[PDB]
Design a protein around this ligand. Sequence first.
Ligand SMILES: *[C@@H]1O[C@H](CO)[C@@H](O)[C@H](O)[C@H]1NC(C)=O
Ligand SMILES: *[C@@H]1O[C@H](CO)[C@@H](O)[C@H](O)[C@H]1NC(C)=O
Ligand SMILES: *[C@@H]1O[C@H](CO)[C@@H](O)[C@H](O)[C@H]1NC(C)=O
Lengths: 157, 108
Amino acid sequence: YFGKLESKLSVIRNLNDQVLFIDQGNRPLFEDMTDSDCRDNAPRTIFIISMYKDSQPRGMAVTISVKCEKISTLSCENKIISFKEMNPPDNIKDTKSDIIFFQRSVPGHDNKMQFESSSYEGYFLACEKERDLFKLILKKEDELGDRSIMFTVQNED
Amino acid sequence: QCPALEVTWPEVEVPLNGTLSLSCVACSRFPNFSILYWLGNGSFIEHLPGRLWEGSTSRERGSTGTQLCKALVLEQLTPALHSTNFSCVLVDPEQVVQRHVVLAQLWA
Ligand SMILES: *[C@@H]1O[C@H](CO)[C@@H](O)[C@H](O)[C@H]1NC(C)=O
Ligand SMILES: *[C@@H]1O[C@H](CO)[C@@H](O)[C@H](O)[C@H]1NC(C)=O
Ligand SMILES: *[C@@H]1O[C@H](CO)[C@@H](O)[C@H](O)[C@H]1NC(C)=O
């Protein structure tokens, strides 16, 4: 079971330096952005990564949430990545959860992170293009050094 | 140097219903995404029966990495706590590290 500790405000970027954001349909997508003007760093791009302590320690367990009119939390329920309108809870009685990911260092890329589902062991958050979209999806790990599941987390607090 | 984890305990045996503290000192290369917490028989400290508690994790940014410190305070050393497998847990994105202490073993 998990208990929530501290949280870090974070901009999450994919391999092409695009920024994660929650779109008008609660889809997690990525967008281009310059590092110069903070009016660009909109509320929908400012993520709250909350760290949890675990009774069975297996990794840096986190939730990823964002504060708009209401707070939304990233989920991988049924292996699809969505945002649920809910606050990350202080306690989680299970050993796994559709909102708990393990944040892992990329072994040969020192400042990059991968996010592994606790619910689906071996499945990771990944960026995939479809039409003109750059989507956040869940992918089973199938390739060593796969850059599609690597992210930079920039602290903004 | 870093990462690192060490637990220290009182050298002198503590009598029944005595008081004591366990010191947990870690180092992590991750200044932000690192935590330190205690477990006793695999349970959060705040879930255990008895008179005990852990203080805040203090954090200091050095030149080797980031030092994390957390104290576990045992207000009344009962047989149950004397036989408890206390575990300091360091967690960051690169690894999990644990150090375990059972007072009854250390003083045996
Ligand atoms: C230690 O504390 C327990 C619980 O209060 C009590 O049962 C026991 O008598 C105490 N021992 C002494 C020596 O007072
Ligand atoms: C910890 O586990 C040991 C072994 O089962 C037991 O003696 C002790 O009472 C436990 N501690 C607590 C607080 O339950
Ligand atoms: C204490 O708990 C840990 C669980 O991670 C275990 O590895 C260790 O052997 C335990 N020690 C004793 C004396 O039970």
